[PDB]
Design a protein around this ligand. Structure first.
Ligand SMILES: Cc1c(-c2ccc(O)cc2)n(Cc2ccc(OCCN3CCCCCC3)cc2)c2ccc(O)cc12
Ligand SMILES: Cc1c(-c2ccc(O)cc2)n(Cc2ccc(OCCN3CCCCCC3)cc2)c2ccc(O)cc12
Lengths: 236, 230
C-alpha cells in the first residue's frame, strides 16, 4: 500500500498518527539545579521516544521497510523529531520553550545548564521562524514525516529498492504539502516558494540536532543515542 | 537589484561567478596538501560570493557571518560536484583523485569520505545539472547563517529570503524548460533542497573531524573575511 492515498488521505493518516503531549514529572523541587533539570528533561525525552516509534510505524510506507532500515532511520532522526516537535508546541509562547505544559522554560533558565543556552537560542529563533511563516498543523505534520524518512536515506538490488521506495513516499509527502498550499489559495509561484522555505528550515534543524548531540556529549551524559536493540525492541 | 532578474539571467550570472578549479601543489602530508588546497580555494570563494545576486546588498558584518557559517559546506558541495563523474572517488584537484582506501590512511576521515561519496552518487542518480548545482550552492551561502535585534537586521533577513525566493523560481524554471511536469517540478525541487540537509550534516561532522586534528584556526577569521571582501 502507502502510494495509493490521495493527498487528503495522507494528511488524515498523518494527523491521527500524532503522538500525545506528555508532561514533566509533577514532582519538581523548583527552582532547579543543572542536574535536576537535566534529570527532568532526560526523563521526558525517554518517554517521548516510545510514542515516537509508535508514530513512526503509522507513517505511510514506514513499515514497508525492513526492520533494520526502520531502526536506521530512527537512529538518525530521533533528536531532530524531538526538536521540531518542541519548536512546534513553543510557537504560541515567544521567548519560551514548552518542553511540557508544566515545563515552560524561559531563556534565562537554559543558562542554568552549561552550553544549553546556545542550543536554546537556536530553538527559539526557529520557533519564531515558524510563527512568522504562520506554519499550519498539516504542514508541520508533513515536515516531521520528511525528517523521519530523509535524515537517514543517504544510508544490493534490495537496498536500491528500499531507497526508491523511501524516495517514492517523500515525493508523495511533497505532493501532499503542495496540495495543502493550493487549497489555502496560494498561487503556483507562492507554492514553490513556501515549499522551499519549509525545507530550508529542515536544514537548520539538522544543524541544531548536530549541535545538540555535541552539547549532550559535552555534559558527559550517560548513553546519548538510543541503541540498536532498544529501537529494535520497541519496534518488536 | 537582483529581484529584477529573470531565471535565465540569474543562471547566467551565477555560471560566470564560478571559481576556478585549483591544483594540489604536488611533486614530480596528505592533510598538508588538502589544507593548503582549501586555503587557496577560500579567496576565490569570497570572490564568488560577492558576485552572487544580492549578496553585496547586505552589510559587511552580515556577509562575513554568512561566509562564516557556509564556507565548509561550499567546499564540500564543490568537491562532490567535480567528483560526480568519478564513482567511488573524490576529485579534490585534477591531480589528486582519491579513493576511500586512501582516505582511510588519515584517522577518522573515512567516515566523512563515505558521506561525501554518498552525496556524489545522489547527484549522479538525479542527473544534477551544472545550472542546478550552481543554484544549490548559492542557497547554501544565503541560507546557512540566516537564522541568527535592530530594524536593519530585520530588513537584511527579508532581503535574503527574497533572493532565496528568486533562486527557487530560477530552479523551478530550469526544470520546466527541461520538460518536467508541474508535479515532477516540485518533487525535484524538494529532492534538491532535502540534499542540503545532508550537506549540513557532513559540514558539522567535518568540523568535528577537523578539530580532532590540528589547525592554526579551523574557522576563517572575521577580519580576514572582512579583509577579503575588501
Ligand atoms: C530538543 C530537546 C532536548 C535537548 C536538545 C538539545 C540539548 O542540548 C539538550 C536537550 N531535550 C532534553 C533531552 C534530549 C535528549 C536526551 O537524551 C537523553 C538520553 N535519551 C535518548 C532517548 C533515550 C534513549 C537515549 C538517551 C535527554 C534530554 C528534549 C526533551 C524533550 C523534547 O521534546 C525536546 C528536547
Ligand atoms: C571535503 C574536504 C576536506 C575535508 C577535510 C577534513 C575532513 O575530515 C573531511 C574533508 N578538505 C580538506 C580540508 C578542508 C578544510 C580544512 O580546514 C582547515 C584549514 N584552513 C581552513 C579554512 C579557513 C581558513 C583556515 C583553515 C582543512 C582541510 C577539503 C579540501 C578541499 C576541498 O575542495 C574539499 C575538502
Amino acid at each position: 500500500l502507502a502510494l495509493s492515498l490521495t493527498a487528503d488521505q495522507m494528511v488524515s493518516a498523518l494527523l491521527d498518527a500524532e503522538p500525545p503531549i506528555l508532561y514533566s514529572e509533577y514532582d519538581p523541587t523548583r527552582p532547579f539545579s543543572e542536574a535536576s533539570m537535566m534529570g527532568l528533561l532526560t526523563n521526558l525525552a525517554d518517554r517521548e521516544l516510545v510514542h515516537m516509534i509508535n508514530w513512526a510505524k503509522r507513517v505511510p510506507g514506514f513499515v514497508d521497510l525492513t526492520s533494520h532500515d526502520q531502526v536506521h532511520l530512527l537512529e538518525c532522526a530521533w533528536l531532530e523529531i524531538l526538536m521540531i516537535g518542541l519548536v512546534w508546541r513553543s510557537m504560541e509562547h515567544p521567548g519560551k520553550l514548552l518542553f511540557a505544559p508544566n515545563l515552560l522554560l524561559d531563556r534565562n533558565q537554559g543558562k542554568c545548564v552549561e552550553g544549553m543556552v546556545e542550543i536554546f537560542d537556536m530553538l527559539l529563533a526557529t520557533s519564531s521562524r515558524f510563527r512568522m511563516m504562520n506554519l499550519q498543523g498539516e504542514e508541520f505534520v508533513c515536515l516531521k514525516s520528511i525528517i523521519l524518512l530523509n535524515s537517514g536515506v543517504y544510508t544490493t538490488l534490495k537496498s536500491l529498492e528500499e531507497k526508491d521506495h523511501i524516495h517514492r513516499v517523500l515525493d508523495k509527502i511533497t505532493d501532499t504539502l503542495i496540495h495543502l498550499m493550493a487549497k489555502a489559495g496560494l498561487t503556483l509561484q507562492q507554492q514553490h516558494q513556501r515549499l522551499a522555505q519549509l525545507l530550508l528550515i529542515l536544514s537548520h534543524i539538522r544543524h541544531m540536532s548536530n549541535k545538540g548531540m555535541e552539547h549532550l556529549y559535552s555534559m558527559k551524559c550517560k548513553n546519548v543515542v538510543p541503541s540498536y536493540d532498544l529501537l529494535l525492541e520497541m519496534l518488536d
